[PDB]
Design an enzyme around this catalytic site. Structure first.
Site, mmCIF file in Angstrom:
data_model
loop_
_atom_site.group_PDB
_atom_site.id
_atom_site.type_symbol
_atom_site.label_atom_id
_atom_site.label_comp_id
_atom_site.label_asym_id
_atom_site.label_seq_id
_atom_site.Cartn_x
_atom_site.Cartn_y
_atom_site.Cartn_z
ATOM 1 C CG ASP B 302 -2.035 -1.028 0.838
ATOM 2 O OD1 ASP B 302 -2.528 -1.112 0.064
ATOM 3 O OD2 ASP B 302 -2.321 -1.853 1.730
ATOM 4 C CE1 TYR B 306 -3.090 0.654 -5.532
ATOM 5 C CE2 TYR B 306 -2.964 -0.336 -3.185
ATOM 6 C CZ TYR B 306 -3.011 -0.394 -4.848
ATOM 7 O OH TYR B 306 -3.653 -1.441 -5.312
ATOM 8 N N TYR B 388 -10.132 -1.348 2.920
ATOM 9 C CA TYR B 388 -9.486 -1.193 4.174
ATOM 10 C C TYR B 388 -9.211 0.361 4.387
ATOM 11 C CG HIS B 441 -3.563 -6.556 7.612
ATOM 12 N ND1 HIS B 441 -4.073 -5.546 6.876
ATOM 13 C CD2 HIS B 441 -4.419 -7.211 7.840
ATOM 14 C CE1 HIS B 441 -5.231 -5.823 6.313
ATOM 15 N NE2 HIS B 441 -5.456 -6.688 7.219
HETATM 16 CU CU LIG Z 1 -7.232 -8.218 7.674
#
Ligand SMILES: [Cu+2]
Ligand SMILES: [Cu+2]
EC number: 1.4.3.21
Lengths: 655, 655
Positions: B302, B306, B388, B441
């Site tokens: 991410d 991004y 998310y 994560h």
């Molecule tokens: Cu998760």
């Protein structure tokens, strides 16, 4: 005595007095003293039958522990309050009971007046006429093979205050007096080969007046942060019964475990589902890591040796509980059999707890958004164990999770250090002539589950990569991973430790039910990572007296009165014998799959002192969580009013 | 353009425009678009010399990344804002840059208008004339060996909304379109062998109107909990420079890392001591655990793909930040080179944080007592990565510790599940026809330390029992234990993982100094337990593209511009090559003892979805702490006014 509103309510001051009058009469002509007078909770089945099957109200019973002058050990029994009579009684001559405030408070004066001790103070550089400056923290002797349980003993960690307002911990002395609790006299003094006279440095103090003198002055009073609830609180209490955000439970309290949460359920849109029948801290052990004599005797099991209830602080003053608080008082018995009260022993309140959940759509630059703030319900107590303070917070959350937060503060345990002495690897020189020994703080969380009903099981869940290799048809890119669930079939299977290698968690579930979506049994998952291995070795006093501390998890069959894992009477027990957790584990073959079980979890921290912890220590956090997984079919907090909410169509409409 | 008040301040809207005008002129006649225009921070030494040695103000530089129509890869360089000129430039034809909102926002419309995609929707049960009901989350393709970096690509996770206000995640489709970002067209569609037509069940929604229909109705609005600061806040900001409770630091922000904290120091009673030169999140990776095609392409980095800055939510509305808040805006460049602003990107405020410390003397029933409440300073941002939301909270505490709290919320990533299909071990059926795949994560915390000055080292600290056996003269009772400190001498030594078996922590210290009391070097200790092992195997796309994720800790020599561990241009990199962390580690022989170092820490969680996480997920916490150990000579918060304080003499006086 008048019956309580709830079968799990603690004994009232009246019930306590009624119980002691009864015991005194039973032992008429005997010189007895009361050590413990507490509620003997109703049998599990009887309680559940009363609560859900119109069964009879369980008998109101009082458990007592007494001492008799000139008699070894103790006598314990049960008083049926309704008939004001002793229905069960037995003498335990080879055990020693929990040490009450009264048992401990007289020790300081006995060492001050003991000739042998006075001589040691003089030898240590303190004039015999200044004994009023000598202080001591009265400790259980823990276990000393020289006396076993033959005599009720205490050991005294001696300190010195140049002024009564000083914090004595910067000035410990080098010797350790052994006191006969009954005879109230020093029977021996452990004196080191290496003599260290009292420190001549200033005391390390922490009150404002001391700080103004140490540093320039205090920091200016900071702008206030006010918290108010103009419309009241959202939780409702009926006696000791709490109702908040669908949670319903009984808030109990006793001299030993302190707060005890029972009959915990969650109202799932009309379907009241049980979660836990009982949850509390059942024992503790703070093993110190210095091998030098007599420091091996420092491994206090605070709960079983002093009592989290007996040591609890009245929360009234101090400003420990900020906001709109609701208090509960605790009632115990004193040596004479008279009820004693500790006001504001438990504080209850709700607080904001950040965001519960949030989501925005990037398509309209987050105009489409929903935000819901979280609020938590906190049930807390703070108890003092001589130098340390344990702040306990039982937290209920709106996602259905239950969390236990502990904050350790207070003062480091200290022993004297010679000017030339190396605190070695066993401790830290946190101040001149001050050695703060390494130690662990371990707790035993006792969970009596009833996950969505009766018939429960437990399991360890380990994250693991697929066993198939990179490049195989089954795991071409090597990213596959799953959760390996190992359900415990027998007690032996449950003896497990937290494993960072698999990010291990544990499930307490109901194998008799299934989640309509996931197809998995409903459960509450224990997410706990502060799980230190027991550093004391197998066969050590520590490992033997706290058999539960050896594993992060211990699951055994339920049996009424299986509360305290180190035995009912902990002080001076050698650790030898089948009692407590050792007895419950047995040969480890008993079934614990789909039945009534008890889940004991060991968690805590390992403490290597640093100057930052002295002379007063900043709060150190410890936390574990029990969260619903597959218990609900969707996020249970979605019907809570959002703090902000804008639909995609509403966003377009706003032009 | 006007020079900033601080060398570390982000580029102003004016500097951005000045930089893009300069680049446009340099490439006059070329059709270019701007991907990135951000501050090129001054060299470490230059900054420190300016800050402490009267050195010159560092040159104000702007780093840019541009794309040129018909040209492969990108062009990057530096603009010297003072002279409005390009001073450094180079073409990188075989790399792909971070995906901006503009790069991503057009993908949905291209798939809606693609004949091949439309046919797949029809095949999936969606009429060709209802394509406006088809949605898709535009993702980096991650890495697809069929195209490498030869074409700038995106993959589209397709979903369906029966109504625009629906949460589309309960209705994913089974195919995955591959889109050429430059040509804006679908070049391929991955279609599974097993076809699953769109779900016919209702959408799983979460807005109040949806809930009222799903469950009886919403819960009544709860009594408000108001927080007010009538006298203002105690923190003081001068531009981006923060001053609070002795802490002083610069709050920066960029398109990629989001919040960047720099020049962190602590005023120790007049002695301003450096702690960290820079701290931030430098990269992330969310590797999914389903091995089935094409799910291996779900391992978004991410931050590097991004941008935590580009994805950040304006905190204004929503009520994300409760209390007296202070905001900061973020400024980036759009494709055209014009400055774009995201207001209230960072929110700052102080909150009560429970007790800082407390201690009462049992001798006078706790009358002698001192209680000091804690207040924390929070610097936060919340960014959205398609489904998310990541809530980041940098927390400064009054005991001198710095904490990073992360709360994950938003919506689960979902893929379609056949009625008869088993979510197998790779995911969970959280709703009919909905498969939420397992995933981790993981984050890369980048710490540039300056612990009490220059010349730092790092070490692993493991709690261990003494090696001497129970019964030996050295460990008679087997309770001895110590902390084994292993200082890293070379890079290879630092590659370590969290170990529950030793309750491992890591120290970042200054070997050139010593604590006058403990005799140990001053340090900040990393206390982090949520450190999942990387589940993807060695050689996997995941492990190769995120070489930093393989270990909890990576310590390498400092070098200017060593910010992003997966390389400067992450999208579509195969993971092959010496760049990022792989380059910094090198052969692992470089010295990292007593020198300028960079400490990269991998932490996070492993997520096995459960129904409770759907359709909207309750916040899941992640936290790590950096606390001073041997840095101070005593508790640094003792000069803070106590909430309550009563001396022993004052207690006696109260009769
Ligand atoms: Cu998760
Ligand atoms: Cu401790």
């Amino acid at each position: 005595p008048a019956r309580p509103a709830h079968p799990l309510d603690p004994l009232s001051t009246a019930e306590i007095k009624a119980a002691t009058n009864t015991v005194k009469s039973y032992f008429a002509g005997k010189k007895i003293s009361f050590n413990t007078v507490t509620l003997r909770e109703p049998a599990r089945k009887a309680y559940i039958q009363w609560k859900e099957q119109g069964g009879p109200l369980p008998p109101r019973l009082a458990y007592y522990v007494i001492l008799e002058a000139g008699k070894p050990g103790v006598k314990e029994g049960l008083v049926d309050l309704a008939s004001l009579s002793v229905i069960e009684t037995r003498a335990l001559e080879t055990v020693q009971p929990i040490l009450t405030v009264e048992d401990l408070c007289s020790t300081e004066e006995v060492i001050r007046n003991d000739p042998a001790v006075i001589e040691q103070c003089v030898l240590s550089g303190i004039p015999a006429n200044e004994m009023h400056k000598v202080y001591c923290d009265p400790w259980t002797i823990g276990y000393d093979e020289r006396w076993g349980t033959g005599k009720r003993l205490q050991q005294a960690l001696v300190y010195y205050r140049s002024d009564e307002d000083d914090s004595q911990y910067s000035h410990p002395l080098d010797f350790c007096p052994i006191v006969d609790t009954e005879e109230k006299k020093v029977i021996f003094i452990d004196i080191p080969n290496r003599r260290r006279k009292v420190s001549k440095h200033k005391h390390a103090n922490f009150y404002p007046k001391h700080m103004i003198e140490k540093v320039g002055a205090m920091r200016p009073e900071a702008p206030p942060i006010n918290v108010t609830q103009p419309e009241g609180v959202s939780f409702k209490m009926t006696g000791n019964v709490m109702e908040w955000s669908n949670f319903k439970f009984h808030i109990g309290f006793n001299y030993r475990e302190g707060i005890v949460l029972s009959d915990v359920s969650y109202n799932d849109h009309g379907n009241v589902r049980p979660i836990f029948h009982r949850i509390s801290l059942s024992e503790m052990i703070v093993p110190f890591g210095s091998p030098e004599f007599p420091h091996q005797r420092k491994h206090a099991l605070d709960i079983g040796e002093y009592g989290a209830g007996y040591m609890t602080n009245p929360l009234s003053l101090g400003c420990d509980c900020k906001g709109v608080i609701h208090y509960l008082d605790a009632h115990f018995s004193d040596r004479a059999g008279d009820p004693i009260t500790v006001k504001n022993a438990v504080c209850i309140h709700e607080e904001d707890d950040g965001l519960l959940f949030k989501h925005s759509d990037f398509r309209d630059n987050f105009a489409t958004s929903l935000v819901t703030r979280a609020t938590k319900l906190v049930v807390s107590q703070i108890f003092t164990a001589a130098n340390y303070e344990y702040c306990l917070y039982w937290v209920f959350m709106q996602d259905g999770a239950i969390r236990l937060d502990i904050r350790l503060t207070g003062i480091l345990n200290t022993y004297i250090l010679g000017d030339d002495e190396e605190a070695g690897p066993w401790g830290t020189r946190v101040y001149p002539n001050v050695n703060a020994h390494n130690h662990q703080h371990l707790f035993s969380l006792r969970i009596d589950p009833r996950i969505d009903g009766d018939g429960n099981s437990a399991a360890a869940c380990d994250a693991k990569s697929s066993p198939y290799p990179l490049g195989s048809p089954e795991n071409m890119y090597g990213n596959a991973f799953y959760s390996e669930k190992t359900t415990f079939k027998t007690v032996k299977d449950s003896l497990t430790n937290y494993e960072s290698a698999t990010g291990r968690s544990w499930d307490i579930f109901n194998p008799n039910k299934v989640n309509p979506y996931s197809g998995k049994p409903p459960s509450y998952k224990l997410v706990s990572t502060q799980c230190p291995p027991l550093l004391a070795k197998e066969g050590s006093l520590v490992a033997k007296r706290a058999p539960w501390a050896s594993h992060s998890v211990n699951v055994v069959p339920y049996k009424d009165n299986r509360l305290y894992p180190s035995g009912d009477h902990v002080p001076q027990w050698s650790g030898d014998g089948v009692r407590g957790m050792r007895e419950w584990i047995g040969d480890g073959s008993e079934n614990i799959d789909n039945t009534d079980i008890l889940f004991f979890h060991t968690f805590g921290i390992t403490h290597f002192p640093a100057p930052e912890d002295f002379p007063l220590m900043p709060a150190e956090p410890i936390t574990l969580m029990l969260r619903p997984r597959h218990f609900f079919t969707e996020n249970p907090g979605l019907d809570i009013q959002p703090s902000y909410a804008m639909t995609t169509s509403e966003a377009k409409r706003a032009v």
